[PDB]
RNA sequence: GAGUCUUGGAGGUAGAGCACUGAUUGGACUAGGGGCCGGUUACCGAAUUCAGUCAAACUCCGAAUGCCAAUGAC
RNA sequence: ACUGGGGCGGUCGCCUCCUAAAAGGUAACGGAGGCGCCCAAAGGUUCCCUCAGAAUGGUUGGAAAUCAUUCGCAGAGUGUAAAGGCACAAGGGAGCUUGACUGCGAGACCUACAAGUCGAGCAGGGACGAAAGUCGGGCUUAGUGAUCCGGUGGUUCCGCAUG
RNA sequence: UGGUGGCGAUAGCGAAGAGGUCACACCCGUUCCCAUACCGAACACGGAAGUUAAGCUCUUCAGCGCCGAUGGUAGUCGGGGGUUUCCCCCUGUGAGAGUAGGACGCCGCCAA
RNA sequence: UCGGAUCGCAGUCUGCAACUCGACUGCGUGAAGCUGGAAUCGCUAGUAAUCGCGGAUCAGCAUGCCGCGGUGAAUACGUUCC
RNA sequence: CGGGAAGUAGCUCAGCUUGGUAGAGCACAUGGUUUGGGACCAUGGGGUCGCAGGUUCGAAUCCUGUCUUCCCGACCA
RNA sequence: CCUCCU
C-alpha cells in the first residue's frame, strides 16, 4: 500500500507558515489566493475583524475567458479584485500566496493586481 | 510500452471483476519501483560507489542518488554521512519499461532460476525481490564488470493486502514459485 | 528528467534467438538475448 | 583559532576585528563590510 | 538483603515523615497483613529479620508479600570525625513507613497461623503495628 | 506611605499523582539465556499486559499563604 | 585566605540544576555537573521539510549499513553541562549571502560601587525576499579580567619664542 | 458546497454508514514557465476520458482521548493544646484522585 | 588444454560374500600444489637421473620388494675440516 | 582514618598521557640438531586488559564506584 | 657443558 498525503493538507501547513508572519488589517488587508484544479479565487480580508472586503474568481460572469485553469485567467482575476478593491477604497495590501509557490498562476494574479492598482 | 497497455486494457478490468470493487479507482496499480544497491564495502574501497552507480545507471536508465549513512556504526566501521549505497526511483514509463525487461529477459538469465518467492510481500501488498548478479540485466556487459554485486528491487503498489498485490503481479508475467 | 545528468535512453527491441520479439526502452540500440520468458522452462513448463 | 583585523581595501582603515580558525581558513579571509570613512560597503580583507 | 539495583543519587536528604501513608493501606494481594501504627524508617536488615520470622513459622507454606521496599539510601560519617568536610558515605537502605501502611501480607495459611506469624515479625520491627484482614 | 476589603496576575512548594525520568512489588505472559537432550525443566529473565508502591535534583496536576498590581471604599 | 582550633588535605572566577519553604533573594568544607570555547557556517535570509524506535518484506548483510511499507507528540534533534524552551519548530534540507553592520538609542531589568542584561525606534549603507518583512551572530543562559604601563593603525586635536 | 477566520480536543482519535450536475478532489498529460541531492512522486504548467475509492462534506456512536461539578478527604493562613522525628483542637480556606455529568463542534465573513 | 586429490552417479571382475574393507572402468567433480624453513639423503659410470617390462606372494588386491633391459649425464682440484 | 600509586598471556614488563593496532622478554608448543640431554637453529600458538557502571559510533586508553596489593601521612598538646 | 642407581 501507499497512503498518499493530501496536497491541500500539505498546502495548509505551508499556508499556516505564511500566516504566522502575515495578516490583514482594515488599513492594509490580506489579498489571499486559493487555486483549485479548475479555477482561481482571490479574497481581500482583514483578520482583526475577520471579514472579506472584496473578491474575484473565475466563477464570476464578468470574465469571458475560455480556460479558467490557465495563467491568463489569473491575470483577469487579478485585475478584477484590484478594481473591486479600489471601489471599497483599498490601495495597500499584503499578498498571501496561500501556501502556493509565488510562481505561475498565483504570480500572474499578483502581477495583474499590482498593475491594476494595488500597492505591494 | 506493452505492459502499461496490458495493465489498462486487460489487467485492471480483470481485477475489478476478480475482487468485486465498487469503483475502478479501487483497482491496485504499481506506484513505483525503487532499486537499491547497498554498498557497505564503500567504507573500505572508495571506488565501490562509483562502480555501483555506473551499473545501476545503465540498469535503471536514470542517474541514481547516492544514499549516505544515517548513523555512525562501530561494528561496520561506518561513520555518519559516508556514502554506503545508491537508490533509483522509477515511475511511469521508465518503471514499466524496466519491469517488462525484468520479467521478460533478466529473471530468465538468473542462474538456476526456479521462480521468485510467494513469501516476499511486506504484509500490506508491496513486493521486494533480491537480485544477486547484475549480469542478468542486458545493459550490463560481462567484460566491464569486475566486482559482482546484486540489488534489492522494491515493487510498491496501491494494493492494501498481499492477495490483491499477488494477483496484480501474477497478471503481469512475473514468475511466482509454483 | 533534468537534462545532461542522465544517460541516453530510447527504443531498443529485444530478440530471443528462440524467436520472441518486442520493443522496450533501454540504453542499447539492439539488445539480443539467448533466453527470455517464452523460452525459459519455469515459465513454459517442463 | 585566532583574532583577525579586517582592513578596508579602499581606504585602509582597520574597521573590524573577528576570529577565524587558521586550520579551516588558512588564506586571508575577505568580507564586504560597511566602511565608516567611505560611508559604503567595501571589501575588507584580513590584515597580513 | 533488599536494596535497589541502581539509584539516581547515592546521597539523599533524610526528608520528613508527616501524614498517613499515601497508599498501601489495605491488604491487597494477601488475606492478612500487618499495618504500621507509627512512622519510622525500616531498614532492609529489619525487613529480612521480619520476613524470616514470619516465613519460618509458616514453614515456607502459603505466600508472603513485602509491600515496603528499602529504596532510600542513608549516609553515615566515619566514627569520631568532626562536623563538615562534605556529606558522609552511603551506609544502608531504608523504607519510609507512615501510619496506615500495610508492611507485609500473608496468604495460604489459617488466620490463627497468620496472626502468630505476623506477631513474631512485629517484634523485629521498630514500630507498633496492628494485624489486619482484607475486605 | 501603610492596613483591610474587592478584583486581576506571575509562580510549581504542601498535598497528591504516575502522563515523563528513575526506583520498585505480585500475577499473567513469554523473546532470550542457564542446568538437563535441533530436544526438556519450579532456574533466571527482557519486552508486553493486569494490578500495586515510591521520589530534594519525577510531574498529567496542584493549594493555603506569601508576592506584584489595579480600583474605589473604610 | 577560607577552615566546626591550627597544620596537612581541599577550595578560590564564571555557568546550570537541587537544597530554596509555588515572586525575587537566601547559608554550610551541603547534593550534582559544566566553562576558560567552538562554528566562515554550526551566522543572515528566502523557500521547502519532519524526528527516535519498532514491526514486516528484501542480494551481499549480521542484533544493527543502505531500500520499501506501516505504526509513530516526539519516546529524536537542538556544536557543548544542566535547566527552561522548541514539531505555525528554536529540529532537518537547499539557493543566495556576510547585519558575526557603522552612528546610536525612548525606556526598562539587575545592582553598594565597578560592571552586567534587554530594547522598540531613528539615520547611514547593505543581505535575502515578488512583497510583507527579517537581519546589529549562534534556542536561551558559561567561553572571561579593572587600572597603570607598553605596542600597532587612524586622526580637521595639542606642540613650552616661532616653523 | 467551496474559500477564509475566531474559539482551551466539549473541536481530537477510532468505528459504522451516506453523498457529488456545479463546487472540492482524486484523475489524464509533460509542448511551454518551473521542478527532482534520482524520480512530472512532489512542486510547476496544461487538460477533462474516468471516479466518489481516498481526501473533502454530512449522519450515527461514549471503546480511547478531552472537558467536569457537588460532597468528602489531604494539605494549609491565623489562633490554641500535647504524650513534640510527630500529633490533636477551633474560626477560615481547600486540592489531587475518584465520581455524577458534558461531549462525536460552537461562532463569523465572502463567493456560488 | 598444468595437477588429478576428493566426492556423486553408472559399471566390470574375482569371490559363498567386496557395508565396515578389494582392484579396475566410464561419465561427472576438478582439492592442495607456482619447486618447498631450519635441516638432511643417495650416487664416482653404463653409475646417478629418467622410461617402461617381468616375477614371487596371490581368487582378487603392490606407489612395496626382488629382478630386467631402454635412454644416459655432471664432477673429483684436493685431504684442511665433518 | 586521610592521601597516593598500581592491577594487561604462565611469570616479569611496555602500551594509558594523544580513543580506532592488544605488544615485548622469558616460558609454552611443533620441527631440526645430539646416542640422549643442555645450549643453539627454524616455525607457531596463547590474553581482551581486576570487577561493575558511565561517556562515546567505538574504551586497555577518558569518567565514576568497588575490590585486591603496595606506599606515604597521622603533627601542637 | 652434562651423561641416574645396582
Ligand atoms: K569543634
Ligand atoms: K542557509
Ligand atoms: Mg510530597
Ligand atoms: Mg587562617
Ligand atoms: Mg580543621
Ligand atoms: Mg595546602
Ligand atoms: Mg517563597
Ligand atoms: Mg523563588
Ligand atoms: Mg599601578
Ligand atoms: Mg615650539
Ligand atoms: Mg477535583
Ligand atoms: Mg665407490
Ligand atoms: Mg597377483
Ligand atoms: Zn524467449
Ligand atoms: Zn574605507
Curated annotation (Swiss-Prot), chain A:
- Molecular function (Gene Ontology), one example: 5S rRNA binding
Q: Where are the transmembrane segments?
A: none
Q: Which domain of life is it from?
A: Bacteria
- What are its GO cellular component terms? cytosolic large ribosomal subunit
- Keyword Nucleotidyltransferase belongs to the record: no
Among InterPro entries, the record links this protein to: Ribosomal_uL18_bac-type (IPR004389), Ribosomal_uL18_bac/euk (IPR005484)
Keyword Lipid metabolism on entry: no
Biological processes annotated in GO: rRNA processing; translation
- Alphabetically list the UniProt keywords: Chaperone, Ribonucleoprotein, Ribosomal protein, RNA-binding, rRNA processing, rRNA-binding
Q: Which family does it belong to?
A: Belongs to the universal ribosomal protein uL18 family.
Query: Quaternary form?
Result: Part of the 50S ribosomal subunit. Part of the 5S rRNA/L5/L18/L25 subcomplex. Contacts the 23S rRNA and 5S rRNA. Required for catalysis of RNase M5.
Q: What function does this protein fulfil?
A: This is one of the proteins that bind and probably mediate the attachment of the 5S RNA into the large ribosomal subunit, where it forms part of the central protuberance. Required for correct processing of both the 5' and 3' ends of 5S rRNA precursor, which is does in conjunction with ribonuclease M5 (RNase M5, rnmV). Possibly folds the 5S rRNA precursor into the correct conformation, thus acting as a chaperone.
Q: What is this protein called?
A: Large ribosomal subunit protein uL18
The coding gene here is rplR
Swiss-Prot record, chain B:
| Annotated Gene3D superfamilies | 3.30.1440.10
Superkingdom of source: Bacteria
One GO biological process from the UniProt record?
translation
Keyword terms of this UniProt record: Ribonucleoprotein, Ribosomal protein, RNA-binding, rRNA-binding, tRNA-binding
What is known about what this protein does?
A: This is one of the proteins that bind and probably mediate the attachment of the 5S RNA into the large ribosomal subunit, where it forms part of the central protuberance. In the 70S ribosome it contacts protein S13 of the 30S subunit (bridge B1b), connecting the 2 subunits; this bridge is implicated in subunit movement. Contacts the P site tRNA; the 5S rRNA and some of its associated proteins might help stabilize positioning of ribosome-bound tRNAs.
Q: Name one GO cellular component term.
A: cytosolic large ribosomal subunit
Q: Listed disulfide bonds for this chain? A: none
The yes or no answer to whether the keyword Transmembrane is present is: no
Protein name, entry field? Large ribosomal subunit protein uL5
UniProt similarity note: Belongs to the universal ribosomal protein uL5 family.
Summarize subunit and interaction data from the UniProt record for this chain: Part of the 50S ribosomal subunit. Part of the 5S rRNA/L5/L18/L25 subcomplex. Contacts the 5S rRNA and the P site tRNA. Forms a bridge to the 30S subunit in the 70S ribosome. Interacts with VmlR. In stalled ribosomes contacts MutS2.
Q: Which PROSITE patterns match?
A: RIBOSOMAL_L5
HAMAP family named among the record's database cross-references: Ribosomal_uL5_B
Q: What is the organism of origin for this protein?
A: Bacillus subtilis (strain 168)
From Swiss-Prot, chain C:
Q: Which cofactor does it need?
A: Zn(2+)
- Quote the cofactor binding remark: Binds 1 zinc ion per subunit. This zinc stabilizes the protein.
Entry binding sites for Zn(2+): 16, 18, 36, 39
- GO CC annotations on file: ribonucleoprotein complex; ribosome
What's in the keyword line of the UniProt record?
Answer: Metal-binding, Ribonucleoprotein, Ribosomal protein, RNA-binding, rRNA-binding, Zinc
- Result of altering residue 36 to A: The protein does not accumulate and cells grow very slowly
- Point out the signal peptide segment: none
Q: Which domain of life is it from?
A: Bacteria
Report the induction information.
Only accumulates during exponential growth.
The processes (GO biological process) annotated in the record are: translation
Write one Gene Ontology MF term.
rRNA binding
The function of this protein is: Binds the 23S rRNA. While neither of the L31 paralogs is essential, this protein seems to function as the main L31 protein. Has a lower affinity for 70S ribosomes than the non-zinc-containing paralog L31B (ytiA); is displaced by it to varying extents, even under zinc-replete conditions.
Q: Which family does it belong to?
A: Belongs to the bacterial ribosomal protein bL31 family. Type A subfamily.
Query: How is this protein organized at the quaternary level?
Result: Part of the 50S ribosomal subunit during exponential growth.
Q: Write down what this protein is called.
A: Large ribosomal subunit protein bL31
Phylogenetic placement of the source organism: Bacteria, Bacillati, Bacillota, Bacilli, Bacillales
* Name of the coding gene: rpmE
**Which span of the parent protein is shown here?**
1 to 46 of 66
Swiss-Prot record, chain D:
- Region Disordered, residue ranges: 19-48
Q: Which GO terms describe its biological process?
A: translation
Tree of life domain: Bacteria
Q: Where is the composition biased (Basic and acidic residues)?
A: 24-48
Q: Has keyword Signal? A: no
Please name the Gene3D superfamilies in this protein's record.
Ribosomal protein L33 (2.20.28.120)
Could you tell me one molecular function GO term of this UniProt entry? structural constituent of ribosome
Family annotation (SUPFAM superfamilies) = Zn-binding ribosomal proteins
Q: Which UniProt keywords apply?
A: Ribonucleoprotein, Ribosomal protein
| A single GO cellular-component term on record | ribonucleoprotein complex
Keyword Ribonucleoprotein listed = yes
Q: What's this protein's family per the entry?
A: Belongs to the bacterial ribosomal protein bL33 family.
The subunit field of the Swiss-Prot or TrEMBL record says: Part of the 50S ribosomal subunit. Interacts with VmlR.
**What is the protein's name according to its record?**
Large ribosomal subunit protein bL33A
Organism expressing this protein natively = Bacillus subtilis (strain 168)
Amino acid at each position: 500500500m501507499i497512503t498518499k498525503t493530501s496536497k491541500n493538507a500539505a498546502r495548509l501547513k505551508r499556508h499556516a507558515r505564511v500566516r504566522a508572519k502575515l495578516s490583514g488589517t482594515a488599513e492594509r488587508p490580506r489579498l489571499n489566493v486559493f487555486r483549485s484544479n479548475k479555477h482561481i479565487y482571490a479574497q481581500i480580508i482583514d483578520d482583526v475583524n475577520g471579514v472579506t472586503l472584496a473578491s474575484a474568481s473565475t466563477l464570476d460572469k464578468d470574465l469571458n475567458v475560455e480556460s479558467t485553469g490557465d495563467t491568463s485567467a489569473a491575470t483577469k482575476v487579478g485585475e478584477l479584485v484590484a478594481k473591486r478593491a479600489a471601489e471599497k477604497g483599498i490601495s495597500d495590501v499584503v499578498f498571501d500566496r496561500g501556501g502556493y509557490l509565488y510562481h505561475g498562476r498565483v504570480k500572474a494574479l499578483a502581477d495583474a493586481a499590482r498593475e491594476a492598482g494595488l500597492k505591494f | 510500452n506493452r505492459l502499461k497497455e496490458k495493465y489498462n486494457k486487460e489487467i485492471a478490468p480483470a481485477l475489478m471483476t476478480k475482487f468485486n470493487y465498487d469503483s475502478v479507482m479501487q483497482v491496485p496499480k504499481i506506484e513505483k519501483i525503487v532499486i537499491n544497491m547497498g554498498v557497505g564495502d564503500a567504507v573500505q574501497n572508495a571506488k565501490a560507489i562509483d562502480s555501483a552507480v555506473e551499473e545501476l545507471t545503465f540498469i535503471a536508465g536514470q542517474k541514481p542518488v547516492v544514499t549516505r549513512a544515517k548513523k555512525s556504526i562501530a561494528g561496520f566501521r561506518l561513520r555518519e554521512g559516508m556514502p554506503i549505497g545508491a537508490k533509483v526511483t522509477l515511475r511511469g514509463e521508465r518503471m514499466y519499461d524496466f519491469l517488462d525487461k525484468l520479467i521478460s529477459v533478466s529473471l530468465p538469465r538468473v542462474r538456476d532460476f526456479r521462480g521468485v518467492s510467494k513469501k516476499s510481500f511486506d504484509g500490506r501488498g508491496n513486493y521486494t525481490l533480491g537480485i544477486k548478479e547484475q549480469l542478468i540485466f542486458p545493459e550490463i556487459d560481462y567484460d566491464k564488470v569486475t566486482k559482482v554485486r546484486g540489488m534489492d528491487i522494491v515493487i510498491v503498489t496501491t494494493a492494501n493486502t498481499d492477495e490483491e498485490a499477488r494477483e496484480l503481479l501474477t497478471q503481469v508475467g512475473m514468475p511466482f514459485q509454483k | 528528467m533534468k537534462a545532461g545528468i542522465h544517460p541516453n535512453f530510447k527504443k531498443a527491441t529485444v530478440k530471443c534467438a528462440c524467436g520472441n520479439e518486442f520493443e522496450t526502452g533501454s540504453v542499447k540500440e539492439e539488445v539480443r538475448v539467448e533466453i527470455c520468458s517464452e523460452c525459459h522452462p519455469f515459465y513454459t513448463g517442463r | 583559532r585566532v583574532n583577525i583585523t579586517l582592513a578596508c581595501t579602499e581606504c585602509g582603515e582597520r574597521n573590524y576585528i573577528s576570529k577565524k580558525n587558521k586550520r579551516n581558513n588558512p588564506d586571508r579571509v575577505e568580507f564586504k563590510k560597511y566602511c565608516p570613512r567611505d560611508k559604503k560597503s567595501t571589501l575588507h580583507r584580513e590584515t597580513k | 538483603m533488599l536494596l535497589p539495583k541502581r539509584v539516581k543519587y547515592r546521597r539523599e536528604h533524610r526528608g520528613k515523615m508527616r501524614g498517613r501513608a499515601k497508599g498501601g493501606t489495605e491488604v491487597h494481594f494477601g488475606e492478612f497483613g500487618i499495618q504500621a501504627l507509627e512512622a519510622s524508617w525500616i531498614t532492609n536488615r529489619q525487613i529480612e529479620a521480619a520476613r524470616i520470622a514470619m516465613t519460618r513459622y509458616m514453614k515456607r507454606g502459603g505466600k508472603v508479600w513485602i509491600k515496603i521496599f528499602p529504596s532510600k539510601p542513608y549516609t553515615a560519617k566515619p566514627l569520631e570525625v568532626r562536623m563538615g568536610s562534605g556529606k558522609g558515605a552511603p551506609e544502608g537502605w531504608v523504607a519510609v513507613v507512615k501510619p496506615g501502611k500495610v508492611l507485609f501480607e500473608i496468604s495460604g495459611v489459617s488466620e490463627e497461623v497468620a496472626r502468630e506469624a505476623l506477631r513474631l515479625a512485629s517484634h523485629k520491627l521498630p514500630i507498633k503495628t496492628k494485624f489486619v484482614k482484607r475486605e
